[PDB]
Amino acid sequence: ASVKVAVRVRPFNSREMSRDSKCIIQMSGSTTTIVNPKQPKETPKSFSFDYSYWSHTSPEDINYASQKQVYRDIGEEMLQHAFEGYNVCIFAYGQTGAGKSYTMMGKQEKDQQGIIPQLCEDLFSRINDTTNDNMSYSVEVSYMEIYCERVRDLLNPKNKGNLRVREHPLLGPYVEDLSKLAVTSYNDIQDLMDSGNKPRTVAATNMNETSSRSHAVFNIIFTQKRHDAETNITTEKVSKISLVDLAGSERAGTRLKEGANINKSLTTLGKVISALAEMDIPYRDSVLTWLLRENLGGNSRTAMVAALSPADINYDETLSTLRYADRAK
């Protein structure tokens, strides 16, 4: 489908433990229900999505949506679409602390790797097992943060902050001077991910709290070169894969300019995705949607995973997230 939407509820976090929070989220099949802690006698509000992932307990539970399960449902098919020659995009949306980064990047031990590392590993595994000498590939990667209309290159510590998105008169949007590195193995792209993830949480990022107030975009340019025994000509097939970890949705203590930009960005993205779902568009209303325009076109495939806190104390924000995800359909 043109657009796929999933929601995922995580285990209680420290804040919720400290408040003795009750779980107000329940899931069954494709449906997620949310209880209003102040109106517990009511029938919970219900929402249906392509996927409703119950990740509130732990991998020890038979009924726990693992990193692997999430990837195999959404990531795997997006990768397949990329191999067919089309652009794809996966967005993680939701309140700060809901589980966006965990879902997209995840962790290392007990292999809690998220969508991005799993997709990258899958990509290279498929490439290396290629047993057709007429097929060769190239994998180029860019990793950046979009904060208040400015782009930060997470793969270049020296540059720092500042880049601007521009519109080439004929070739579309691009970030001037943004690093685009060729990678020939999973280990190498994993080194880049690690380095970039490190950059997102260094001490200085706490000044403007960019780990939660900026949009992190991991881009892969996948080129497939097909050789012809006869004619000896090579036809190319380029696919653009954009894996995005959005700024916290509650921020849409917040600076007026920060909030304005995050609100505008998340709001425009919602309009874009809803339009794409309707066909199966004001891209320049925000830098995020402008830069990703070609990944959000009629030919592209997009998916969103909306992270949810399970706690009573976040009812309002969680309901807002469910409604946002619902509209994206």
Ligand X SMILES: Nc1ncnc2c1ncn2[C@@H]1O[C@H](COP(=O)(O)OP(=O)(O)O)[C@@H](O)[C@H]1O
Binding-site residues sit at 64, 97-102, 212
Query: Is 11 one of the binding residues for ligand X (CB under 6 A)?
Result: yes
The question of whether 245 is a catalytic residue gets the answer yes
Three-state secondary-structure class, residue 83: helix
Instruction: Give the separation between CA 7 and CA 19, rounded to whole angstroms.
Output: 24
Segments in 153-205 forming alpha helices (H)? 186-200
DSSP H or E run through 117: helix 115-128
Site for ligand X in 293-322 (CB under 6 A): 307
Site string for ligand X, 232-251 (x = CB under 6 A): --------------------
**Per annotation, catalytic residue among 51, 102, 147, 324:** 102
Judged by CB under 5 A, the stretch of 33-41, 78-86, 99-107, 275-283 that binds Mg ion is: 99-107
Q: Residue 38 CB, nearest distance to ligand X (Å)?
A: 25
Choose which of 96, 190, 309, 318 interacts with ligand X (CB under 6 A).
96
Q: Ramachandran region of residue 267, left (φ > 0), alpha (ψ -120 to 50) or beta?
A: alpha
Query: Is 212 one of the binding residues for ligand X (CB under 6 A)?
Result: yes
Residue in this structure with the two tokens 């969508």, named with its chain if needed: 115
Query: Is 101 one of the binding residues for Mg ion (CB under 5 A)?
Result: yes
Residue in this structure with the two tokens 């007990």, named with its chain if needed: 110
**Per annotation, catalytic residue among 75, 94, 99, 196:** 99
The question of whether 22 is a catalytic residue gets the answer no
Residue 13 site contact among ligand X, Mg ion, none (CB < 5 to 8 Å, cut-off depends on kind)? ligand X
Instruction: Give the separation between CA 53 and CA 30, rounded to whole angstroms.
Output: 8
Choose which of 24, 78, 98, 244 interacts with ligand X (CB under 6 A).
98
The strand ranges marked E within the chain are 3-9, 25-28, 31-34, 45-48, 51-54, 88-93, 135-147, 150-153, 165-168, 172-175, 181-183, 215-227, 234-245, 301-308
Pair type for strands 234-245 and 88-93: parallel
Query: Is 205 one of the binding residues for Mg ion (CB under 5 A)?
Result: no
Q: Which is nearer to Mg ion, 101 or 249 (CB)?
A: 101
Query: Is 200 one of the binding residues for ligand X (CB under 6 A)?
Result: no
**What residues contact 9, with CB distance under 8 A and at least 6 apart?**
25, 27, 32, 53, 54, 55, 56, 308, 309, 310
Query: How many residues sit in the footprint of ligand X (CB under 6 A)?
Result: 14
Binding site for ligand X (CB under 6 A): 10-11, 13, 55, 94, 96-102, 212, 307
Binding site for Mg ion (CB under 5 A): 100-101
Active-site positions?
97, 99-102, 245, 248
